[PDB]
Subunit: 178 residues, 6 copies
C-alpha cells in the first residue's frame, strides 16, 4: 500500500511516497495531501482501472462495497498536482487490495487512462534527477517519454534502470513483488 | 471500459481526444473527470440519459443503473476542455461499455447530442478535422448541418478523410460499433 | 409522435435574446431524481423546480402514479448546450414537457408558449413579449400561448405577426396543457347528450 | 386558498406585497425554497417550519410529516430578489395552511419576524409595507405588536383604511388568518 | 423549545442575545440559523457534543440524537453574530430543551465551552455587561478567568449586577436552570 | 482521556494546542472543529485512518467507524490553527478516546503522521518547545529528524523538558498513554 512516484510538487518534480489504505468499510474514497484537482482526478481514474480489472487482479469484483479507501501523499503541507502519479496510484491500490508488496528500489512516473494505457508526462529530467539522488535503482516511465531520455545526463541514465511501459499490466508486473 | 475518439475543443494542443467510459459494479453513481468545463460535463449527463432512455432497443437492461457506476474520463487529464462536441462520442462509448461492443479505432466523431438522439452541428470544424487528419484517423463522423462547412477544409484533408455526415445517434452507433 | 413526447418549444431569454427554446425531457427508470442542464441560469432552474411541483401537486388529476414517479429519474435539458438561458418565462413550457414525459402524451406540433408559472397553477405575464413573438414568427410556429395579462402588450406587435400567429392568452396551467398536448391530460371524458 | 399567504417584506424594489406559496405533496422530507430568496429569508422558512413541527400535534398535523411530505415554498415573481425576516409569520401560516388543508383568508396581509418560540418580532420599513398593502386592496393587516409605535409615522389616510391587528404570538396570527380555527 | 439569554458578539457589537433551541421528533439532524458566523456555528457543535457525552448524567435519554432533530436559532435573524461566547448558553438551551427544565429569566451568561465542559474567558466583557444591565438582567454568568476584566467596567454597573464567575458547565446549569439538573 | 497536548501552528497565541475528542455511540459521523485549516483537517483524516488500520491490535472494535460518532475539537475556537504538526497528537487522542485509556499529564508531542505510522519532521521546533515549557509540559515527543534542530534551542529550555525523538506511532502511544 506504498509506492514511490515521481510527480509535480510546489517546488518541482519530485519523489513522492504515495500511500493507500483499504480498511473494511462501505465504499468511501478519501484522498488527502495538499492535492490539486488534476491529481485528485488521477486518483479516481486509478481506482476505476482497478474496479474495472478486479477479476483479472484476483480481487473480489464487489470489493468497493466492503472497503473504505484513503489515498494520502505526504508531506501533508506541500502542494502537489498533475497526472504523473497516476500509475503509482493504481499500483498502490492493487498492492493494498491484494496484499502484494511493492518493490523497494522502484519508482514510477506516468499518467493513467481508464483503458489502462500509460501516457507521457513532462519534466522527465527533473523527475529522474530526483530518483537518482534518492538512490532509486529502477524507474518506470511512459513508453512515449523515451525521446526525452536524451536530455538526461549520461551518468544518471547509466545509474538508473529505466523501463518504458505502454500499459498498466506492465507496470504492475514490474513493480509488485508477486 | 468503452473507448471512442472524439473531436472537441481543448485549451492546449489538438482537439483530438479519447473519450473513455467505464461501467463497473456499483449503485448508480456517475463520475466525470478530465479538466472538463461545465458545458462538457452537461453533455456527459445528456449522453447518459440518451442511453438510459433507449436501453432496451440498444440491448441493455433498463435497470442497469441500479447496479452499475459510470465513470467518464477524457484524457489528457490536465488539458482543459469544454463544449458539447464530444456528446456523440460519449453516447457511443457508453453503449460500447454496457454491451461490450467494440468501437472502430479508425473512426473519430464530433457532434452535440440531444435527448431526442439528434446530432447538432459544432463549431471549429476545421480545427477538428486537422486534428483528425494529423492524428492518423481514416473515418470521421460529423453533424449533417456541418456539411456546408466542409467547403473551407483543405483539399488534401478532404481527400484523406472518409467523412460521414450524420443526423441521428442510430447512424453514429452503426458506423462506429464493430457489430 | 413518440418524438413529440417531452419536447416543448418555449419562448424565454437566451444569450442572443428572448428566443426559442427547444426544451427536452426524458423520464427514464430511476429513483426519483431530477437533473436539469443546458447552461440554465438560476432563475430558470427554479422555474423547473416550480413546474415539477405543479405536476406533483396535480398528479391525481394528471393520472401520474406517485409510485411510478418515485421509480423514475427525470432529466430536463435545453439544447443548444452551450447557450446561456435564463428567466422564468419557460415555466409553463417546462411543466408541459414534464407532464408530457411522465404521461407519454405527445405535444402538439407547431405550438410554442411563454409565461411564468406559480405553484397555484397561475400563469404570470412575462417580459419582452415582442421579441419572443418575433422569435416564434421567425420559426414558423403557428400557435403561441401567452399569459392573459400580456394581452395589452399585443398592440405593439405588427399586424402580420398577429395575422400569422394563432395567439391564445391563458390564465391557468390546465388550459396550457389542454392547448399544448395531443390528449386531454386532466380528467376522464364524460359524454353527454341533451 | 390553501397554501397561499399575502406577506409584506423587502424586495429589490422595496417592501412589497408578496404572495407566498407552499405545496406539501407526499414525499420523503425534501424542502425546496424558491423565488430568488435571500439567505435571511431562507432561514425564516426554516424557523417557520420548526415552529410548525413543534406544534404539529397541537395543529392536528401528523408529527412525522417532516419525513412523509416534501415541501416547496415559492414566492413569485421568480426573478425578483426578496430578502429579510419579515415574511416569517406568513411562511408559518402558509406552511400550516398547506399541511392542514385550512384555507387562508385573501383579505389578510401579514408581516413579522417569527422566533422558534412562536413569537412575533418587530420589523423594518413598516411604511412601505402598509402603503403596499393599501394599494393592493388588503383590508386587514397583521403587524408585530412592538411595531405600533411605527404606525404614527405613516399617513392617517392609509391607516384609516386598514384593519390593523398588532400581534405578539403565532397562534394569534393563525386564528386571524386561517378560514377555520387552527 | 429552549431559551437562554447569552451575551455575545453581534454586528452592532457585544450584546444581549436570546438563544433558542427546539428539539422535535427527528432522525438526529442539526439545524442552526440566525446569521451565524462559522466560529459561532462550531460553538453549537461543541455545545451539542457536551450534551451527548453527558446525557445520562444530565438525565437525558442517551439515544436522543437519533430520536430528536435539533434546531438552534438566534434572533434577530438578519443580525450577523459570531464568536464562541454563546457556547455555554447553547449548551444550557439544549439541556433545557431536552429535559423540560426551564431556564431562569433573570440570568444571562457569556462563555466559550470546551468538549471537557470547561468555560473559557471571552473578550468584550465591558460591552457585554453593559447590555445585560440595560436589559434589566439581575444575575450574570461569566468565565472565571474574566474576573480581573471586571475592573475595567464602571463600578456603578457592576455593583448593580449579581456576577457569578464559573469554571465548569455544571455550575452554569445549576445556576441557570430553574430546577436542579 | 481523549485530551492531548500537541504542538502545532497557530496564527496567534502559543504554538500549544489542547486537542479534545469525544467518541459517543453513533452512526459514524466525524466532526472536527476549532477554526482548523485544511492541512490540519487532512491531518485528522490521516490519523483516523491509522487508527482504523490498526483497530484490532489497538483493542478497538473494528466497526467503531460505524457505531461511533467522533468529534475532534481544538480550542480556543476562534484561534486559527493549521499545518501537519498535530498529526501524532490527533492519533493519540483518538486511540485514547476509543479505548478509555487516559493520556499522561505533562506530556506534549509534535509531529506529522503518515498512514504507515511514520512520524515526519516539523518546523518551528524552537517556538513549539518554548510553548511546551511555559505550559509546564515535562515530557515532549518530537520527530526523530527534528533532532538536528534541538541544537538551535536555549539551554534552560532543553534542560527542563524530557525530549523524546520518536520514529513511529507505536513509540508515541507507548510514551503518551497511561495504559498499554
Amino acid at each position: 500500500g506504498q509506492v514511490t512516484g515521481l510527480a509535480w510538487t510546489e517546488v518541482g518534480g519530485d519523489l513522492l511516497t504515495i500511500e493507500t489504505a483499504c480498511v473494511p468499510g462501505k465504499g468511501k474514497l478519501t484522498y488527502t495531501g495538499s492535492l490539486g484537482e488534476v491529481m485528485q482526478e488521477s486518483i479516481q481514474a486509478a481506482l476505476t482501472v482497478v474496479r474495472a480489472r478486479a477479476e483479472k487482479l484476483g480481487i473480489n469484483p464487489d470489493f468497493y462495497e466492503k472497503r473504505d479507501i484513503h489515498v494520502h501523499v505526504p508531506e501533508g503541507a506541500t502542494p502537489k498536482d498533475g497526472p504523473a502519479a497516476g500509475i503509482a496510484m493504481c499500483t498502490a491500490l492493487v498492492s493494498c487490495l491484494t496484499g502484494n508488496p511493492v518493490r523497494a528500489d522502484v519508482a514510477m512516473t506516468g499518467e493513467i487512462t481508464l483503458r489502462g494505457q500509460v501516457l507521457p508526462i513532462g519534466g522527465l529530467k527533473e523527475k529522474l534527477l530526483a530518483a537518482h539522488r534518492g538512490g532509486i535503482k529502477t524507474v518506470l516511465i511512459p513508453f512515449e517519454n523515451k525521446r526525452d531520455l536524451e536530455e538526461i545526463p549520461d551518468n544518471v541514465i547509466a545509474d538508473l534502470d529505466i523501463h518504458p511501459v505502454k500499459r498498466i499490466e506492465e507496470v504492475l508486473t514490474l513493480a509488485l513483488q508477486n
